[PDB]
Amino acid sequence: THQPILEKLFKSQSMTQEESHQLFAAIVRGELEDSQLAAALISMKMRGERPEEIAGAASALLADAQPFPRPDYDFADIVGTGGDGTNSINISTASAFVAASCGAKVAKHGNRCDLLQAFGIRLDMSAEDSRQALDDLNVCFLFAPQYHTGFRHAMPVRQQLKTRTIFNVLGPLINPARPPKALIGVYSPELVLPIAQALKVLGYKNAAVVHGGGMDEVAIHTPTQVAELNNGEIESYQLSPQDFGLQSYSLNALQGGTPEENRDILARLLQGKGDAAHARQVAANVALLLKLFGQDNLRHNAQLALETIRSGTAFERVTALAAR
Amino acid sequence: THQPILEKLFKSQSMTQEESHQLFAAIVRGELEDSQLAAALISMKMRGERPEEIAGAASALLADAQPFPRPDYDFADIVGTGGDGSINISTASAFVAASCGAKVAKHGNRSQPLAGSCDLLQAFGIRLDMSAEDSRQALDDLNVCFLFAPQYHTGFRHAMPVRQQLKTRTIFNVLGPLINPARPPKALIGVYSPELVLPIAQALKVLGYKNAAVVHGGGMDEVAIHTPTQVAELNNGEIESYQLSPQDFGLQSYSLNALQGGTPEENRDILARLLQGKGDAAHARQVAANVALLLKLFGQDNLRHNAQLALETIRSGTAFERVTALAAR
């Protein structure tokens, strides 16, 4: 029984990391009544979740996660919380393949993947085969439902409440490969710093949390709020498209469509035949990701990302993964 | 769909009286999922319920309650919100006050139970599922009757499960005392916190009460005998607040421990020997103080005389004779 923890939440008091871990462990095991779960999520929502509580909940999910043979070499994740409802095109997947073509190791993780399916990539690839793909192709994809079997237990309540809760930010924090690096986008500017603070608690070494003009990614249409973890310290700052030596395009230039149309958009992009605005947005995101690997000149990183995209080399890497 | 209202609550925003009415009307009809109901209750709990929200909610609950042949003569209810953390003073007070000429139509819900009014009454052989007609007859003849919430508020079946699972006080604790189906013009209502005294008083005015007193004393939901009591009195559409002490009733102070209860069976015995004039002085004093304030709502302004009369009634044992009488109906 976690009544003492619930009563504490009802008093608008924050849980310790240990208490949060205890409570969420019970949740992802399906031990709470719908009423208790809803009460917990809403009480935390109205007060405002703290970094230690976020790390505690993420820790509980990671403790129950399916195994993954973690490599010793440097590697990163690139993912966003999702959040806007305008159906803008996915940017993280293209960025992963472009970065991988450069030699950066990307063990991408995400929950409902639609784009990757559209390209013949198997979402239920074994952890061993994904690790082999990471070794050989510098990229793999870990589908959340395959690794966090207990994540399902909160879905009904989350759908019934139809409001954002802590679960909306936990997905990007529970990569089963436990990467030392990560570029993570969030749906609001106020979540950037606390999430970066949670990543520190979770043991990440180099990471950047971002939000720009309403989007959970490095923005091409507005300034981007960043919180960068490095050498044990977190630095807050903003970036502008000009800092990458890139033109600033409208959010409307990134508009997506049906699943088939998005598939074609991404294919054209990675083949070096995409829209200029799409290529710039990917270039900006790959650029910041590479900063986590020690490449500090963002303008330089963006220019070379644009060259990698033009080469079309990233699309054959998609084909290569699909063959695994 | 009432999502817009839920989202407003989730933003820590207060609902208007009409928004609250619409939401609780849905709740008592089972239109909300356990998750939605729980979310609504906790969001209001953390923010602090406003009078307009309370009035709107109580209004929706009353709008769906079973009818009751309402008399035109003066009568009232005496009960508390609970959720304060003791023996039940309101039940003894109802029978003692009825013996002092006042009319009391007591309404209570399930505590499954333990030491709530309904639990104690049933123990005395009083039928909780008495017909509306029979209760009215008892109010006429014996100056007292009991209305069981589950009987008059059939929609609670949609709220009790979640309330039990949450195991924490919510707006339902403050709504309970406000949904008497006989809708009496007067009432003495105890609340679990001082900050709730004014808003509840304001809500009573909206519900149409003519003379009422909302009280809180030393952490208890009633007129205290171990500490000062905060009061908000509604009269002539106007509210006024002041403090009372045991001395204002011409009574001695007692420690809160003096009102400590025991097992369900022991609480029943405590109440029985009290009404029989063979009880604890501290308990008699507490009942006397609560009865005294209740009688003030009926026009008896001398609290000291009121209390004296209540004490005499208790020692006479006639109040338990009244319990026996109701147990025969």
TrEMBL record, chain B:
Q: Which residues bind anthranilate 1?
A: G80, N109
Its recorded name reads Anthranilate phosphoribosyltransferase
The residues the record assigns to binding 5-phospho-alpha-D-ribose 1-diphosphate are G80, G83, D84, S86, N88, I89, S90, T91, S117
Q: Which residues are in the Glycosyl transferase family 3 N-terminal domain? A: 3-63
Identify the residues that bind Mn(2+) 2. S90, E222
**What function is annotated for this protein?**
Catalyzes the transfer of the phosphoribosyl group of 5-phosphorylribose-1-pyrophosphate (PRPP) to anthranilate to yield N-(5'-phosphoribosyl)-anthranilate (PRA).
* Record keywords: Amino-acid biosynthesis, Aromatic amino acid biosynthesis, Glycosyltransferase, Magnesium, Metal-binding, Transferase, Tryptophan biosynthesis
Q: Which of the seven top EC classes does this enzyme belong to?
A: transferase
This protein's assembly is summarised as: Homodimer.
Q: Which residues bind anthranilate 2?
A: R163
User: What is any one of the record's Gene Ontology cellular component terms?
Assistant: cytosol
PANTHER family linked: ANTHRANILATE PHOSPHORIBOSYLTRANSFERASE
- Tell me which residues bind Mn(2+) 1: D84, D221, E222
Q: Which reaction does it catalyse?
A: N-(5-phospho-beta-D-ribosyl)anthranilate + diphosphate = 5-phospho-alpha-D-ribose 1-diphosphate + anthranilate
This entry's comment on the bound cofactor is: Binds 2 magnesium ions per monomer.
> Pfam family of this protein, just one?
Glycos_trans_3N
